[PDB]
Amino acid sequence: AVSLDRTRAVFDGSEKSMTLDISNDNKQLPYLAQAWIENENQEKIITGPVIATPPVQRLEPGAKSMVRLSTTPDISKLPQDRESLFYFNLREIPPRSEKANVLQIALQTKIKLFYRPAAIKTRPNEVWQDQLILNKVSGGYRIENPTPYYVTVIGLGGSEKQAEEGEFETVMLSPRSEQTVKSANYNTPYLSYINDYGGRPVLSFICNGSRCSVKK
Amino acid sequence: AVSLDRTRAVFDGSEKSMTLDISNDNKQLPYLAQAWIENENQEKIITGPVIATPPVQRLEPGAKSMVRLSTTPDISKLPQDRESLFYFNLREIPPRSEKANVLQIALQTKIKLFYRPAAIKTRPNEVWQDQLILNKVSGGYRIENPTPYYVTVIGLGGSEKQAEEGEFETVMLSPRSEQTVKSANYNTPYLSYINDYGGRPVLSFICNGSRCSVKK
Amino acid sequence: RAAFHGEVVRPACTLAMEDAWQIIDMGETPVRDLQNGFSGPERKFSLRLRNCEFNSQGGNLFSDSRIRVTFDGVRGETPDKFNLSGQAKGINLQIADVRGNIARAGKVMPAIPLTGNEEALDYTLRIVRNGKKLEAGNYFAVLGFRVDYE
């Protein structure tokens, strides 16, 4: 019943807080909504450096509200030249029915929360994902992410259609890192990723030996 | 040579400052760029409540830079339940040529700068312009703007195409105000306005006697 | 449409079910079926995920692994069972997707292609034994359906 307005959140480190719109889409009953944050290892945190308010709130049927994300002083301890990963959680508490022998479902929404320090703030629609490099190796590719942002790769094939629809085990590369993915070899590999807006652009790559980089 | 990234600026009163990207599009010569703010009556202000930095800066050929807008403490004195109008100015100073008998052109860009207090902050793509009301009178219409925002009307005709292309003397309504516009009578008037993004949406109106309101 | 406009993002999915309480009626404790060595009757329940453009040209968020779903609850007798609350004793819950994959508490469900091109996730539950003495009585269970977004 309770839903969130986005599939990922980017916290602009140049501001003190931001808000996320939530909504009880059930127009008959009231639902409660709890929110909390988790660190990069999906472990719950309560005292900072990022807090969510309110932790719990009642939503009347069809009601709209929001959850505010704010930082504590300790936020400054995070790296300022790369993103830091957190997770935002919105779990509903359905109205208690006293029906016998029933099962009740409570939705929990968990999205990535990227803390993006001011030094690497981006302009709307900026594209850094085109800096990825694919290195052919046994079994597939070793993808390199030299950028200061997390990059979520959702597709990799021999064509655009294949990158968007081909079966691929989603993987997320931390800033300045590299990971290996099992994959068939592709003459001109195409790669798809998820951007800040929940969109899925496709990138065209060109190879030279075992090293592939984005079409200039 | 020097250009600005937008045709209007909205200063979110919930933040302390914002930046505007500028650019020397001349790839051969260096141009200087001065920036300043003006109040609602287009009179220059220098000490606040809104300041532009830097006031002057040198731009190498093809160089990109920006101007930062920030508020002073006096900003709090402005109304918090409606927008306040300012103007942002970007005037270039072309490189001095010492050619005889010449005329040199220096572009000056002047855009509206809407200070939007936190209490009336808006969500992306929010539409309040559909709250306008048209009242038929001698010569044309008396347009009412009951919203807390400035509304710039650029079109008014008997059809969508007429609202977008018809000849119309652009007018801007201050928050909570009304103005009269000379116009022919239209069975189902259509009105066009300019939004925060420089876009020009069209609104469909329905009349009842002399009072017309947006199609429900 | 408009060439110039504000930020537009994909919202997260909102979960909907036939019942406004997001409840699945399990029926009286199937003692007869249980004692005979079987499991209680199956109860279907569909979870519709809306407002998130769940379906795309050639797939959907779930099948393509763009979202990962997990049923959260208390493990029962075996990893393939969920514990139940209430007076009743001797019974556990079991959940399976449209291909027979049995859900394990806190363990992600395998991505699989959907059928019917419906914008919904269909599951089936049934009551099973937990290795304890059967004791009829009302039972209850609140399960968390967690959607992790990539």
Place this chain on the structure above:
Amino acid sequence: RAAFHGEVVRPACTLAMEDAWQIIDMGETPVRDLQNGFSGPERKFSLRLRNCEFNSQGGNLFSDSRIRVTFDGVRGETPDKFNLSGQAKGINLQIADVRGNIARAGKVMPAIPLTGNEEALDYTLRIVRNGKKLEAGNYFAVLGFRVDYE
């Protein structure tokens, strides 16, 4: 194209001219033409406004009054003339749009339909008398072309 993306706004126009110095050569002081009671020869100069999608389906920012242009400078002898700098004496500047409308310092130019569907604003200037004794010599003038956005 993309259904989900960041804010995209119409940028302001960037002014471009044939000369990298954004200069118009006026030629030697036309004493002959002046003394004869005429005005110096005409010099055309086009101002191209780019990057702002100047042209639309059935119009353009200028003709539709979406932007207003004004030539800023020092008033000369009459409101229809601009003062000139330099050694020369006895001369003023005059600017006119494609229909003969003479620009007045700090006064907005009238909106009019454009010809050629070109994404440019074309003006014509010429030297005129200012009611003072003619004194040949180099002259100069920096004029501001102000674009106010609605």
